[PDB]
Design an enzyme around this catalytic site. Structure first.
Site, PDB file in Angstrom:
ATOM      1  CG  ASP A 293      -0.300   0.312   2.519  1.00 25.27           C
ATOM      2  OD1 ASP A 293       0.950   0.475   2.535  1.00 25.27           O
ATOM      3  OD2 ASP A 293      -1.033   0.455   3.535  1.00 25.27           O
TER       4      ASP A 293
ATOM      5  CG  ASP B 181       1.276   3.134   4.814  1.00 23.10           C
ATOM      6  OD1 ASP B 181       0.167   2.730   5.172  1.00 23.10           O
ATOM      7  OD2 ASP B 181       2.194   2.406   4.407  1.00 23.10           O
TER       8      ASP B 181
ATOM      9  CG  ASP C 231      -3.441   2.549   5.065  1.00 19.10           C
ATOM     10  OD1 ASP C 231      -4.605   2.253   4.717  1.00 19.10           O
ATOM     11  OD2 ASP C 231      -2.610   1.713   5.466  1.00 19.10           O
TER      12      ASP C 231
HETATM   13  N1  2TM Z   1       0.018  -3.586  13.168  1.00 23.85           N
HETATM   14  C1  2TM Z   1       0.641  -2.474  12.766  1.00 23.85           C
HETATM   15  C2  2TM Z   1       0.551  -2.101  11.396  1.00 23.85           C
HETATM   16  C3  2TM Z   1       1.183  -0.992  11.043  1.00 23.85           C
HETATM   17  N2  2TM Z   1       1.911  -0.269  11.939  1.00 23.85           N
HETATM   18  C4  2TM Z   1       2.609   0.934  11.512  1.00 23.85           C
HETATM   19  O1  2TM Z   1       2.038   1.341  10.282  1.00 23.85           O
HETATM   20  C5  2TM Z   1       3.072   1.448   9.293  1.00 23.85           C
HETATM   21  C6  2TM Z   1       2.491   1.202   7.926  1.00 23.85           C
HETATM   22  O2  2TM Z   1       1.873  -0.047   7.992  1.00 23.85           O
HETATM   23  P1  2TM Z   1       1.660  -0.967   6.724  1.00 23.85           P
HETATM   24  O3  2TM Z   1       0.638  -1.992   7.134  1.00 23.85           O
HETATM   25  O4  2TM Z   1       1.186  -0.086   5.597  1.00 23.85           O
HETATM   26  C7  2TM Z   1       3.141  -1.903   6.490  1.00 23.85           C
HETATM   27  P2  2TM Z   1       4.516  -1.103   5.654  1.00 23.85           P
HETATM   28  O5  2TM Z   1       5.668  -1.087   6.637  1.00 23.85           O
HETATM   29  O6  2TM Z   1       4.134   0.227   5.062  1.00 23.85           O
HETATM   30  O7  2TM Z   1       4.899  -2.127   4.502  1.00 23.85           O
HETATM   31  P3  2TM Z   1       3.867  -2.529   3.291  1.00 23.85           P
HETATM   32  O8  2TM Z   1       2.700  -1.558   3.353  1.00 23.85           O
HETATM   33  O9  2TM Z   1       4.700  -2.572   2.061  1.00 23.85           O
HETATM   34  O10 2TM Z   1       3.443  -3.952   3.678  1.00 23.85           O
HETATM   35  C8  2TM Z   1       4.023   0.372   9.736  1.00 23.85           C
HETATM   36  O11 2TM Z   1       5.255   0.470   9.036  1.00 23.85           O
HETATM   37  C9  2TM Z   1       4.085   0.656  11.254  1.00 23.85           C
HETATM   38  O12 2TM Z   1       4.741   1.856  11.538  1.00 23.85           O
HETATM   39  C10 2TM Z   1       2.015  -0.651  13.253  1.00 23.85           C
HETATM   40  O13 2TM Z   1       2.687   0.081  13.991  1.00 23.85           O
HETATM   41  N3  2TM Z   1       1.356  -1.764  13.653  1.00 23.85           N
HETATM   42 MG    MG Z   2      -0.707   0.925   5.442  1.00 29.36          MG
HETATM   43 MG    MG Z   3       2.457   0.446   3.913  1.00 27.57          MG
END
Ligand code: 2TM
Ligand code: MG
Ligand code: MG
Ligand code: CL
Ligand code: CL
Ligand code: CL
Ligand code: NA
Ligand code: NA
Length: 327
Positions: free
Chosen positions: A193, A195, A251
């Site tokens: 995604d 963010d 997001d």
């Molecule tokens: N449970 C959680 C889920 C999210 N977060 C926080 O949200 C950010 C973006 O989640 P995200 O889900 O967009 C994962 P990202 O690191 O951006 O990689 P991707 O989108 O390529 O998979 C994470 O990197 C954490 O800082 C958290 O603190 N606890």
């Molecule tokens: Mg996200």
């Molecule tokens: Mg992300």
DNA sequence: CGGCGTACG
DNA sequence: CGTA
DNA sequence: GCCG
């Protein structure tokens, strides 16, 4: 090697990729069974290997490393000796693992929902499509868009997306800013995604901002799905492609500028880095950290940070740039 | 043995 | 329950 | 599953 991930640099690419991937399979499988403690240990052990300066070649190099006990060490031993760990391969090919992975990958479906579907005998996405009465609106959107959402978002996609978000944000509230966070801020070249963190330099002006932003993006025809007073939006966006378009998860989160360092730190991740940082803060420093602030429960005071650097300093930690937070 | 992050939609 |  |  310090015991918390927030105490050590973790780069995006490293020297123990195969070993870390195997441990993360076991972590994920533990999560599918509700075993949060085992998930955490396997995630932490994987993260330790990511932080090492060179490849592990012999079992003795695990001695003294935190989060390596009998189980994680045996996984590594088998990979070093045979190139494969039988336990990991058994998980990989198991019907339970493959189906829980498939279902929890759907937007709107968590472990609890996936597990209930699994116990009901459901196994495929078409099984879910055939019984759509069992689906929330969010799950219906996640299932309809599942193919596109399974395609990595490219860093080269992000700039055009940020420009359209900035346009809507600027009409909603002139002077408001959009900051890229999440995995792309940590240097990832792909993601699941995008963010974005939104604020305004005049404290209070960001109140009520996100509905105004979402209404404007929806009017531009860019929103394929969103949940609609709110401050976080988890939406599916229409992103242009040659002669067509693809669905992308985006997001959006609004924070007041006083909280922006905390929100930036929180939303930049990684997920494991933030859990470890909050655990460190509370257990080692007696301070409660979230994406809004840093609370001293003895003085009943909040730390007024002006930067991420401020927050690391207040916690007694050496500063780590986002690129070294890939725990 | 207890603990394992901490929020918002 | 879902989401970050 | 591992730490303290
Ligand atoms: N449970 C959680 C889920 C999210 N977060 C926080 O949200 C950010 C973006 O989640 P995200 O889900 O967009 C994962 P990202 O690191 O951006 O990689 P991707 O989108 O390529 O998979 C994470 O990197 C954490 O800082 C958290 O603190 N606890
Ligand atoms: Mg996200
Ligand atoms: Mg992300
Ligand atoms: Cl557990
Ligand atoms: Cl900052
Ligand atoms: Cl939070
Ligand atoms: Na999901
Ligand atoms: Na908590």
């Amino acid at each position: 090697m310090p015991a918390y991930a927030c105490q050590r640099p973790t780069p995006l690419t490293h020297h123990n990729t195969g070993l870390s991937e195997a441990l993360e399979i076991l972590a994920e499988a533990a999560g599918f069974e509700g075993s949060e403690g085992r998930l955490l240990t396997f995630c932490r052990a994987a993260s330790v290997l990511k932080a090492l300066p060179s490849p592990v070649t012999t079992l003795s190099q695990l001695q003294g490393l935190p989060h390596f006990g009998e189980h994680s060490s045996r996984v590594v031993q088998e990979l070093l000796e045979h190139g494969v760990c039988e336990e990991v391969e058994r998980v990989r090919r198991s019907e339970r693992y493959q189906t829980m992975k498939l279902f929890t990958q759907i937007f709107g479906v968590g472990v609890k929902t996936a597990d209930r579907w699994y116990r009901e005998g459901l196994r495929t996405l078409d099984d879910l499509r055939e019984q759509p009465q069992k689906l929330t609106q969010q799950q219906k959107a996640g299932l309809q868009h599942h193919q596109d959402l399974s395609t990595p978002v490219l860093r080269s996609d992000v700039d055009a997306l940020q420009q359209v978000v900035e346009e809507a944000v600027g009409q909603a509230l002139p002077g408001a800013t959009v900051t890229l966070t999440g995995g792309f801020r940590r240097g990832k070249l792909q993601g699941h995604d995008v963010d974005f963190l939104i604020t305004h330099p005049k404290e209070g002006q960001e109140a009520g901002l996100l509905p105004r932003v979402m209404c404007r993006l929806q009017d531009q025809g860019l929103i394929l799905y969103h949940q609609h007073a709110f401050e976080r939006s988890f939406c599916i966006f229409r992103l242009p492609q040659p002669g067509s378009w693809k669905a992308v998860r985006v997001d959006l989160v609004v924070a007041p500028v006083s909280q922006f360092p905390f929100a930036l730190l929180g939303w930049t991740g990684s997920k494991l880095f933030q859990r470890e940082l909050r655990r460190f803060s509370r257990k080692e420093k007696g301070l409660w950290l979230n994406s809004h602030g840093l609370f001293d429960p003895e003085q009943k005071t909040f730390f007024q940070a002006a930067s991420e650097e401020d927050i690391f300093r207040h916690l007694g930690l050496e500063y780590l740039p986002p690129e070294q937070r890939n725990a």
